[PDB]
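Session log. Operator J.P. requested a structure for one protein chain; no other inputs attached. Running the standard single-chain path with token output.
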Amino acid sequence: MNIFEMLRIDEGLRLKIYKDTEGYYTIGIGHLLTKSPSLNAAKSELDKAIGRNTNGVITKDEAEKLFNQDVDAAVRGILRNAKLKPVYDSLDAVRRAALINMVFQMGETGVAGFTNSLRMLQQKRWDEAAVNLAKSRWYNQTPNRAKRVITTFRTGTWDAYK
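Structure written below.
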């Protein structure tokens, strides 16, 4: 298991524009196109991202390309963020993947606001961090995925993805 396979499990793969759990136009492996309610704005973002007139449909290779870019962006965003970098650097590789997963789903600014959870993770108080992470809109809106990510932080294993 690795961060890419982990996110493929959590995000799936759809080759036509679809709405995410928040109602936002998305494509591929959880590639957010826009928060605008305009499907035309979403199709324009898609064509810009792929480099061609896609007509709202992409190939698997194209979806995987955006996914690689998005994972890279999540990691780079963690490393550039003064709140996330110390936590990330303190974690082992499996728990680093859990943090990347959160940032992929909700964005660097959103995760960086989880101040108390991040501190518990930095302190390696895993059960306490897990309890605190669940007191969130994130957990309430996507509980099955949040449970998997939280178990990964709690245990430092891939048990929730096997």
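Operator note: DSSP finds ten helices and three strands in the chain.
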